[model samples]
Target: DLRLHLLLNTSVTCNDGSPAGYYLKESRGSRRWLLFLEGGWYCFNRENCDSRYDTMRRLMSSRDWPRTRTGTGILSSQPEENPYWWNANMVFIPYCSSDVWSGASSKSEKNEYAFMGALIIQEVVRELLGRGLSGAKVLLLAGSSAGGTGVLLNVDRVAEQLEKLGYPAIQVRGLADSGWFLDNKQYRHTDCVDTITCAPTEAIRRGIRYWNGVVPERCRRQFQEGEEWNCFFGYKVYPTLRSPVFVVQWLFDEAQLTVDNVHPVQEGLRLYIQNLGRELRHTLKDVPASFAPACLSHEIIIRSHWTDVQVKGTSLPRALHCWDRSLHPLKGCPVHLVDSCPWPHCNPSCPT
Candidate 1:
């Protein structure tokens, strides 16, 4: 059941002009599918991309990708490790384009790399339809970090793609983990040339153009010219998303803090983390299903100890299961499980 099958799609490619691929673990007779997207930070310009190719080639190209990839946490085939949906068909899409799964450009004379993240998702879905996705009763497009953000940007498109392909009966849902980022002002301001200390807004603004990134149509229409990058933030795009999405995020997201130039301090750190939690809670209030723990961390669903973390005594897996059940019929379980307390590390179940 856990046999890993690898397939490379020659039509799509990564940033460094290498073919893209995904790993599949099929469960016989199961109609449920979980397509997990891999996540790595992106490069906003040629200089940044060149530097990435030189140092982090694996994240920029699939040339070195292994024949088999080990699934873990949400993608786990073990029933004990992943209680729900263990037997469901699992597909892992590795990250290589460095465009946050939003790019559409290809390798050219001017553009030395091919950023085809958006195309890759579309092609993968197309390939799956022929394999087994057309028979899927429910498909959960799940991802963490950049991939998590990718779910928000591409979930509606995936749903629409399915309908156009004549599979209107299948249900498409999103499970975004640790990707609910804010567009707030940074603690320290710097131009986006340097990725680490740059403001998110500036970085994304440049990255979108450099990578020729694609955003959801509904969300894209909301922004003015040259402002399409706003859709990259969860709060901005979440309002326009038509697909049901279950967000799993930390109250004080470490990845978000890094981009916002949030450094460690005593009183300032306390107040900042508290404010971040408040904003995140406010942003997620309208979301029907979410699991927000009061922890200073990032990327959960992929971790081996994912089941151990909880918010308001409800773990992510439990919340997600409740969400899945509620989709079909009315259920009383609390799916929007967010920590009420403001302080970070408030959850006792949080990693030590």
Candidate 2:
């Protein structure tokens, strides 16, 4: 069994420069490390951010941050539940910055709002190295929702840093859950369970523009002043990655609908999602290590159906099993090349 330890007194800091730390679960005789990034909505304006930081700013207080899950699915220490990562050392990075661990700011809002996610990554990596990560045989970076997006945006950077740390023997694996967002040029103003007057496109636009330095430089060169935010999309960043990272995306991201307190769904969102899958096939043409299950779901390894939710007789853990072996031979994949997902719902216990 893995023991959960809240490193509240550790040498870590969040966006506000206030003390921040991560939750850790260790294992013996294991050189594998799985780091999971926490997720949440992005704050765009100063007024919203002020409220955002007001609650979860410091880890100095025992109750400051929400507790990390030690249960079976996401952070399971049980061998049978999560065979791939069960024996691996694990850490969870909380998200306090509005950006996906990539934003860095220098303006006034920076101090009041605090956009230092990238810095947090550096600090945590260095700190973990001293503890155990240096000896890692393999490293897996995983995240969901906003955290999922952060992993995708920052995974390459994290891998690069690991290589810089002189861990040439390290095998880096990335898993992005519920982070794939569409780059559709059209969107309508609507309300979500979390945000009001939500314009998906504009929300992302505001996030990228305000987060400064959050988007990659090369991606920035492709668009105009207001259009640069498009670079934040996974499809935009996927092709540029040096390491082969596995992406776990859904044809229908439930968060965009009734799940995760989101109340709105874009018009023709289904077509957009399928298009995303097709585009993903191209972006990851060389590396087909991916999961594009057709379902009204979001995130992975964090729900009761983590392993039960399957497509084409392939569950999340099953895919990871192949990934761990460095194989991407997807047999009986649920999603088809184009039509209704060729991959059928693999878990018989679950609803069709």
Candidate 3:
């Protein structure tokens, strides 16, 4: 069992000179770092759950991420952009509930995701420079859901940071599961449970009801703004992502739904593939390899109830959720039953 030791808490200033929270933690003997960034649940300040950190540690330990087969250990950076601060070699920043709501909002002017993304990038740059490791090694940025969106939307920023520091360009890696990518109009009018007619109004109504007891009435508007911001899905202005992306989607996930029932996630993947195919056909035909993988499902990670009990030896129900059976290597119920093909696209052969 790997033991994690909490190191310190501190504050870091962003590019805008705003003070942000930072936490540092370390385990015995490792340099491979895992950065845990929380999804947007509230504003960065209000999120104070120790379980979030514990969950991150559990995920890392279970997956043994960043650690090489050769037994090179790992490190975690400090979450300087978040409110609940800790200090470590690898930082895990929790999602602010407030940021999520704002990012999902309908107002075109409210760039919730962009705002938060900027802050995250700024903090990361600050941390890298402060360590005096400006020219040391490549930095890897990874996230899930909203955090995933941040990586994609602000990939250029990460590249820019690396260039500015004269580092050998960092790699911005993304693992987005059930990602949202609707146009701004679609996002402004949708909710977590269901799509609404007047999304802004409905979002406000639900926001009021949801936070009536906890958040003050005076703060309702700000909270309402938070609920309506949908950064990943609604962001149509594609900023050319400087790094490769690994996208994972679920069929049942609501965000990927299309009018014809062809999941939006599938559509996005198709578009990405087509774009890559075109680029390959002409420019850089002799490219070493494809940067992006064909869209895969998170089901590969999630194990079934029976499989969990018999194969991996996991008793946690949540562990089952993590194993995505749809992406299983072998043929199975959901994997074979679901018809994900809605376009004229090539299906990757099943792994033996």
Candidate 4:
């Protein structure tokens, strides 16, 4: 049984200037690598960031990080649980920068805290090269929530970086879960009070400016200088991404509802959810390797019942296994399994 080991790299630090780290479970002689990024919400402004640091210190600083952690869901070592990736090398990077893994700036006179999220990812990969990633044939960059968004923003960049470092043979792919947030109008006209209530466009626009965020070059090029925040939305950025990605999103994502202020008890709830489901289906129609279940949930990839949720007849794990095979070989089935039923919890296989 290969246990997850805590490994820290001082070269990269968190928002509070503490060392950043990751949990690694090595499979001896394996050339496949799966780097999963942990996620927490982000703060777009100073006051919000200060409150975030006060309440969620562990997410902003790695000073109190655990010496070890247990891997579950897709990071599981058991063949029955994780299926295809059970034997691949697993690395879980913690989220501490509060920048959605996109910032590149360090602490300066103007800013009290560092925002080195994007740099941290690069540094971690640099640190991993000596350990075993140099020989990696396939690197699956996966994440949930904010980190899932991170995967979308960084997959192509990571692949390009690896090629630049003379490891052109390493094929990098992305697996984003519950992070395909839509840029839609809220159910009601609620003020952008906080990150939770803020319109995604406004929040991301502020975040990109505050954090000095970096996006995939192709996506960045498509947007104007000030509107680069458009790249934060998956739909806007997905079209420009060169790296192959398998998106796993819920049709009625809980986070999206929370931000949009779409309460279940509210009037027109059924129509609202139905519309959200339709929009998600429309957005993912052309994507050939995605799994969108009509479930009223947020993050699902790291849950114990991750394997239980299914879109159409195929479970998320099964679809991911098929996606993995499609990369190197050809034994897998087509994986665009979105639920057509126009309601949440339409899939009986959904977790309770």
Best by lDDT: 1
* Candidate rank order under lDDT: 1, 4, 2, 3
Better of 1 and 4 by TM-score: 1
Q: lDDT of model 1 at residue 63?
A: 78
Judge candidate 4 at residue 139 and give its lDDT. Answer: 94
Model 1 per-residue lDDT tens digits across residues 175-260 = 99988899876666776547666677888888888888899998888896799989988989988988899998888888888877
- Hey, what RMSD does candidate 1 come out at? 1.8
What C-alpha lDDT does candidate 1 achieve relative to the native structure?
Answer: 0.85
Instruction: Give the range where candidate 4 is weakest over 10 consecutive residues by summed lDDT.
Output: 1-10
Candidates in order, TM-scores: namely 0.95, 0.78, 0.41, 0.95
Model 2 lDDT at residue 10: 42
Question: Which ten-residue region of model 3 has the weakest summed lDDT?
Answer: 68-77
Candidate 4 local lDDT, 116-203, one digit each (tens): 8898888778878988999999999999999999999999989989999999999999999888988887788767777666787888
TM-score of 1: 0.95
Cα shift from native, residue 274, model 1 (Å): 1.4
Native-structure RMSD, model 2: 5.0
Clashes (backbone N, CA, C under 3 Å), per candidate, total 0, 10, 55, 0
RMSD of 4: 2.1
Candidate 4 structure, TM-score to reference? 0.95
- The digit string of per-residue lDDT tens for model 3 on 1-352 reads 1232221222222112133333334332433233544443222211222243344433212222332211111121222222111122354443432333222221124321111334444564566455443433334444455555554444455566667766554443433333433332231233435432334334434533332212112233433555423223312212233454434333223332331133334665556434433432232222211111123332221122212211112221222223223212333211111213332223232211
Instruction: List candidate 2 segments past 4 Å from native.
Output: 1-12, 53-63, 66-71, 106-110, 185-195, 217-227, 258-287, 327-339, 342-352
